[PDB]
Amino acid sequence: PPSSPPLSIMGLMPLTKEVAKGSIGRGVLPAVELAIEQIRNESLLRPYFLDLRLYDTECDNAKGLKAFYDAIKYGPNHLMVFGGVCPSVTSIIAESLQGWNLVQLSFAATTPVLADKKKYPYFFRTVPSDNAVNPAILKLLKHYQWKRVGTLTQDVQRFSEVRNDLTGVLYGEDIEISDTESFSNDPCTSVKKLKGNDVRIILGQFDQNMAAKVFCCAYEENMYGSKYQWIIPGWYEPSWWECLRKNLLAAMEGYIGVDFEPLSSKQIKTISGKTPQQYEREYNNKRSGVGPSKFHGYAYDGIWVIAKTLQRAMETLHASSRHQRIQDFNYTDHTLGRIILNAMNETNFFGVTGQVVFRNGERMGTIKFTQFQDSREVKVGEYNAVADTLEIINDTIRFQGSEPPKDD
């Protein structure tokens, strides 16, 4: 309707075909379109409508910052930020939010430092962060009775922060970190030290490029097979591996990968009235000139978070004043920013990625366990953060020995 006022949202993401990460932005847009379509058809925000404006960050610090500045200068009066995919771009935007009283919701930035509420107070994310693997690993360790672990960490912020977070997760839990090892560019010296300390269960935190070097050092040190269990990040690209390949594969056999779960396994009706499976089919039908994105469900639920936040932000008997305050917004109103921040903090619904709820701006979600089995990563379990429960899939997880390895 012409009389239907907009509730403007600043969409920031890589979209261009010129950048590799443009595929993420383009890949989530069908999910975003489906959420917007249904919210409008339902007139959930009546008499208003959700006005999502898109700005290309091009996954670049300079272009992302100017896209944000140009959105402020020349775009409509945005009430919140939706997006931030590339960690460095997301950080630049997220730390500056307070200057414009803007609440931000990301569906793809997983780096741990964004959990810092002193630095990023106005930042929220629907996607479980890199630190979210730690409470899941704790449950996995308890499950297989592994009470002694060693750590191998690449001396880079995103990895050292996950490792530092681990100490706090394991405290009061009866799990010993018998050996802590760190490396910059060569893990071999650190792998040799772990072998020398008789570490059997290894918790790794390093990038995709370093993973091949780590497994090559494990191969050279014979730190693989029935006596060892490597637990590393599960967010690497599919077939990231493709040392001689056969020797690398021997060392990699049975490693456990840990990452977020893209979509809920539960066949329950979500807030949209659709099950995660029905949503997945609708998503694959809507997308046309784009490959699927693993963050699509997080983007979809992200639009629902914005809609529910806005609905809550308008729930007052001081209706005309609240509507006037929204209409008047020009980045200077601390009160409206606070109303929106508090409304988002109250989020609690069942989404396509599972129960959507925040703990200090961080998603309480689902973590997926995979195991490397003959050049394929097989899903072996799920950990639910809200319930703090681990479900291991029957007849999936396998061990090279007659029994799982002993921690000593």
Partner: protein, 395 residues
Amino acid sequence: RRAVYIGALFPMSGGWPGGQACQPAVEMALEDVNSYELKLIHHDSKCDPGQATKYLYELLYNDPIKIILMPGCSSVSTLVAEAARMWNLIVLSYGSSSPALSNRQRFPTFFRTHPSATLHNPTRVKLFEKWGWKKIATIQQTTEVFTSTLDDLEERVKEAGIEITFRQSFFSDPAVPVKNLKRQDARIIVGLFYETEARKVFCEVYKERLFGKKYVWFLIGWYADNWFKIYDPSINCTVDEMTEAVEGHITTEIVMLNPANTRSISNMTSQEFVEKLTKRLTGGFQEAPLAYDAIWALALALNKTSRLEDFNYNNQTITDQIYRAMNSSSFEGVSGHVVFDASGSRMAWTLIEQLQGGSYKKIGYYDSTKDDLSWSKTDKWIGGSPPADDYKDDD
């Protein structure tokens, strides 16, 4: 006399509160240069990229047009120098030590009067050699200034046959890194962080007993002299506990003021600059000569380029001319001979100090160019000699 505007950021608080003395140093220099007209439009960055982002928007999206941007902190300078290409703007920093800022591909319009932090590294290596250490540990806070300094240190230690046997990093809480250094039995430790984080580190150092005869800490020397004595709500450690944890540590800093009693382009001696700056007044006091010289460097580059009213953010023409003048800068400032090379090595000396009985004492100076370690014989150690880098007796 057309007005020409400098968009500047000064850190009055935060990681490095350099603006406290660098802003008056800039104001003193502008008066001297003026007597076109060079005008200053400034904001307090609080050494914070989040806060600087708001001020950068105000500088770029509001009239008057600015010919140059002048940031302080490495984090703020990294943000403004990365972004500046979008507005074809020259960036000139007076306080940024980040080795990563030497990357011309990433920072194509950037200049600095502050040398690169890489200059601390040959001095650290010279002292490791002097004291016979081949095993070192590192602890860093994760700002790029520190990470890129450690990347350079790794190369210099490797070259000297010295190994970094343990590394730890933290974003804000050093509790786990410090506990791990203690459990690893690390002895010689290089700590790279701002003063604020140094207090958090040393309170953990006290609690873990990671101080005493066996332990040698190497820190950055540009903290305030009383840094460990300052009240901090984020630390439980008392002043006396902090004072004991920091005892005997070594610091390195770069000599930024000419030690010779000569008169520069401004016609001042290093000594008169100090009285003049004191007349105006503190964080950034040691860096103040670089701020003073940054204005002179800009003034001389603007003189050579001399169509300034016609500068626009969509035009490369004026940017390229100013860049070329800055690139060919060569004059005598209060900080010595000012020039602008990519890897930031115009300074030849470092000053080495040791904390003795709660007070810093000069112990020497090092010139990496000529390989000259000037030693005062003023260093003190429990038992009369420095400790070992590890146990050596397990046959």
